[PDB]
Nucleic acid binder design. Structure first.
Length: 102
RNA sequence: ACGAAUCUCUUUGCCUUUUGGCUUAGAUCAAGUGUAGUAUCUGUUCUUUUCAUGUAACAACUAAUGACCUCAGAGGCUC
């Protein structure tokens, strides 16, 4: 049991997004360079604007999905426990935090 | 009882609005009246300071506005 370290958590997050990129290519397949300017020193990479848009969309979708999966957790945990005496929400979140200690 | 994806749900992981010093626990757990000072309101006294009927005849007012012309705003004329 126990917790998962950050180097093991990062690999599992990297393994998970590779399966999201695998099925994204499978759902697409189901439906149907390097230039180095010598004067400036800058390196320009030419890439597809669709794959850059799909990168920007999927990060926003994962940002909203974790935002909504946490918002429902806020609305559920506020309306679970009311037995022990509280005063405000920061007291409830602290007295619940004492319960996970024991 | 192994779905390639979405939603809903359960359990672990994450705690994600999840107690921000000090010292003699920092110190104490007590009725009315009397006096002094400031402020407000009322009363009295003293002083100072703010003005000047009717009729007839004559004169002024209802300076400003509009327009035209000359000179480089003023001058003249009419309404």
């Amino acid at each position: 049991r126990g917790g998962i370290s950050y180097d093991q958590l990062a690999k599992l997050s990297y393994e998970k997004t590779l399966r999201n990129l695998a099925t994204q290519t499978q759902n697409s397949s189901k439906q149907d360079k390097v230039q180095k300017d010598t004067k400036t020193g800058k390196i320009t990479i030419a890439d597809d604007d669709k794959l850059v848009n799909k990168l920007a969309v999927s990060l926003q979708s994962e940002s909203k999905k974790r935002y909504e999966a946490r918002k429902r957790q806020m609305q559920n945990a506020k309306t679970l426990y009311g037995v022990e005496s509280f005063i405000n929400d920061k007291n409830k979140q602290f007295n619940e935090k004492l319960s996970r200690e024991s």
